Design an enzyme around this catalytic site. Sequence first.
Site, mmCIF file in Angstrom:
data_model
loop_
_atom_site.group_PDB
_atom_site.id
_atom_site.type_symbol
_atom_site.label_atom_id
_atom_site.label_comp_id
_atom_site.label_asym_id
_atom_site.label_seq_id
_atom_site.Cartn_x
_atom_site.Cartn_y
_atom_site.Cartn_z
ATOM 1 N N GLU A 35 0.826 -1.189 0.000
ATOM 2 C CA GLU A 35 0.000 0.000 0.000
ATOM 3 C C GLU A 35 0.878 1.264 0.000
ATOM 4 O OE1 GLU A 35 -3.065 0.296 -0.562
ATOM 5 O OE2 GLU A 35 -4.076 -1.569 0.020
ATOM 6 N N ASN A 46 -7.835 8.870 -5.363
ATOM 7 C CA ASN A 46 -8.705 7.926 -6.079
ATOM 8 C C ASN A 46 -9.539 8.618 -7.181
ATOM 9 O OD1 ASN A 46 -9.416 6.607 -2.826
ATOM 10 N ND2 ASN A 46 -7.966 5.816 -4.349
ATOM 11 N N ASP A 48 -12.666 8.708 -7.633
ATOM 12 C CA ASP A 48 -13.903 9.287 -7.153
ATOM 13 C C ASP A 48 -13.703 10.577 -6.373
ATOM 14 O OD1 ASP A 48 -12.958 8.378 -4.721
ATOM 15 O OD2 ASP A 48 -14.680 7.139 -4.223
ATOM 16 N N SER A 50 -11.908 10.794 -3.569
ATOM 17 C CA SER A 50 -11.421 10.509 -2.238
ATOM 18 C C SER A 50 -9.879 10.326 -2.331
ATOM 19 C CB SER A 50 -12.084 9.232 -1.692
ATOM 20 O OG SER A 50 -11.721 8.130 -2.493
ATOM 21 N N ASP A 52 -6.416 8.205 -0.331
ATOM 22 C CA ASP A 52 -5.918 7.202 0.596
ATOM 23 C C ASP A 52 -4.710 7.785 1.326
ATOM 24 O OD1 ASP A 52 -7.667 5.348 -0.631
ATOM 25 O OD2 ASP A 52 -6.096 4.798 -2.048
ATOM 26 N N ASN A 59 -8.820 5.246 3.351
ATOM 27 C CA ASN A 59 -9.551 6.103 2.431
ATOM 28 C C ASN A 59 -10.531 7.079 3.078
ATOM 29 O OD1 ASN A 59 -12.168 6.163 0.454
ATOM 30 N ND2 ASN A 59 -10.270 6.543 -0.576
#
Length: 129
Positions: A35, A46, A48, A50, A52, A59
């Site tokens: 990650e 991301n 959309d 959002s 992380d 998120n």
Amino acid sequence: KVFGRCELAAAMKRHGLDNYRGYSLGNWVCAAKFESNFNTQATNRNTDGSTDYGILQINSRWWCNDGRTPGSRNLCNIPCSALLSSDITASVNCAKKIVSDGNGMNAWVAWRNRCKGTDVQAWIRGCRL
Ligand SMILES: [Cl-]
Ligand SMILES: [Cl-]
Ligand SMILES: [Cl-]
Ligand SMILES: [Cl-]
Ligand SMILES: [Cl-]
Ligand SMILES: [Cl-]
Ligand SMILES: [Cl-]
Ligand code: NA
């Protein structure tokens, strides 16, 4: 902070992730590696809108507040920025809520695609745990 592998294992273990929801420590170390490459400062946007955050790329769509993810929740009750600290307490505490949400570690897409079913014990080999 960029953690060493065994360093991160030891902190995760202290903070109670070893076998949390039945996930051995190596699963958590593997997740963190893929990650964030063990970098607490890692961020990824991301599609959309959002973002992380941190060693486990938690998120903002559900789990933290960054003031810029419309419609999102803050289920860990933290500013996303707390997930970037050299202190991993907030990331671990929030990861515990995530992994209890019903899909276990499948919540982390990188864990499902890169760690799940692999010899995850390799990620803690050699550590003085
Ligand atoms: Cl490594
Ligand atoms: Cl393990
Ligand atoms: Cl928001
Ligand atoms: Cl922005
Ligand atoms: Cl909320
Ligand atoms: Cl906040
Ligand atoms: Cl599970
Ligand atoms: Na949010």
